[PDB]
Design a protein around this ligand. Sequence first.
Ligand SMILES: C[C@@H]1N(C)c2ccc(Cl)cc2S(=O)(=O)N1C
Ligand SMILES: C[C@@H]1N(C)c2ccc(Cl)cc2S(=O)(=O)N1C
Ligand SMILES: N[C@@H](CCC(=O)O)C(=O)O
Ligand SMILES: N[C@@H](CCC(=O)O)C(=O)O
Lengths: 254, 260
Amino acid sequence: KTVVVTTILESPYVMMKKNHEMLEGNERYEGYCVDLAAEIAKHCGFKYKLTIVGDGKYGARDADTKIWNGMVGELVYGKADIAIAPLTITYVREEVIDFSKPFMSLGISIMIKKGTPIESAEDLSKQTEIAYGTLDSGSTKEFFRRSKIAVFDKMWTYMRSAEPSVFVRTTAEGVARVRKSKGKYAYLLESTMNEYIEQRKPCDTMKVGGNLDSKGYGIATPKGSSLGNAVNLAVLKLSEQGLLDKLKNKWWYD
Amino acid sequence: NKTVVVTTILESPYVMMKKNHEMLEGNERYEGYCVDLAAEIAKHCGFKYKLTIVGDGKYGARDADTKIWNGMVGELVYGKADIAIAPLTITYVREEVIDFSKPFMSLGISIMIKKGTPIESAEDLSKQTEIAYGTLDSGSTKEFFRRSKIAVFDKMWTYMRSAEPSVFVRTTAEGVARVRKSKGKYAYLLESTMNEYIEQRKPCDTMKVGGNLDSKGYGIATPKGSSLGNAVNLAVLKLSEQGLLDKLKNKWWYDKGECG
Ligand SMILES: C[C@@H]1N(C)c2ccc(Cl)cc2S(=O)(=O)N1C
Ligand SMILES: C[C@@H]1N(C)c2ccc(Cl)cc2S(=O)(=O)N1C
Ligand SMILES: N[C@@H](CCC(=O)O)C(=O)O
Ligand SMILES: N[C@@H](CCC(=O)O)C(=O)O
């Protein structure tokens, strides 16, 4: 009767507390999604255990084996009962799992070293001095692979063959490359993470131009889960009480 | 298979009467964002449909006494329509009685003023009484202020609910006209989508001030347990990821803007 929640280490959604080595269970973690999980469980009235996804991935279907990895796979293959994390609502995912109404908005955004002469995605697709890449096994990478839009298709064709790999396993990994590469690398990531980094030291990164798309994160359940309805209503309630806004302010507090 | 009844509402630029509507019939009488959206959705889910303007011209609220739903929500609840394709706001009380797809457009509650009006925030409105302000009836915006426990919004509700004469309007157009005619003495609380649209229409004498008071979206609504729900939801996501929804908003908001 304990609900297994799958989630992922991603600041400021889920982070390890200081001195977590002597802590146990859910008390090991803090962040936006940790608070969110507590509020949902309170409303739906269930006990839950937070577990970090084994592979540290969000969820992608390996075209070769047609096997889902990451948090999506955990739901699909019955390892978890619910995903509470910055998991992007997409078409391919909605085909295999259920999403609640979005609890937070985001768009794919460009992260440049401050001062970098880039103002748009067109600018990136018209230069080769500055490199660019995305996170592996995520919705951002799938966006460019699938985009039949002019600029985005060009950006993808460069990215898929880039040597060495412009793709990273973690968001933190992509952050460093923008910083190290002296303005020769632009990271493609979601505006939420981008806006978060923009506020943190050494404050040398910059969100540039508008978002490339418009979407949201949603709480995910296995298809035909009895938990789905109550969770969706919980999210809506929290939104209308303004609690989602206060959580955003709290963890993106400058 | 049967012709699907679509309930919707005459709200610019979502559903508008074509210039030659009087010599047109069926769905051909109408044009707008939601009309194009309905065509796209129907094509993917492979159904034929008939657009129907909701009888009472309301979005949907539940009578406190009779517990009866009006507007487009009522149409779905009592089985008069199979689907709603309109700027219908996703809310908690509505999700309890009908289903919504994932949102196809984002909005927040915003403030409309006549240009030059000394108001830059909702707190500015709550602090004064010289400038009156209100909302649309039978809609999600009015329910927001009625239900809010946030001090400034509750202060605004306490004012609005007892204001004389009534600061509430029956249509968006009535609300816009009231802003334009009141010489800066009326501000209108409406959804950012509507606000931004009007901002681009002649006489170009209004504007949106401050940030949005909340964050939500419009969704395609179906009766609970409808078999159309899944296909429609998937269709909305597909159109979103193809960039179709962004192109539709550009077409109806800014591609024909009249204020430069
Ligand atoms: C179709 C649908 N769209 C457009 C939007 C729009 C805004 C937000 Cl905050 C979330 C979503 S989503 O993730 O529910 N999905 C992609
Ligand atoms: C909870 C949920 N929230 C926060 C949001 C946020 C952004 C958009 Cl575009 C739509 C919605 S909604 O209408 O699906 N609903 C109110
Ligand atoms: N939120 C994304 C991961 C972040 C990214 O791909 O940039 C997902 O759900 O796949
Ligand atoms: N979109 C609102 C109506 C407009 C408003 O209330 O401002 C609704 O669905 O109730």
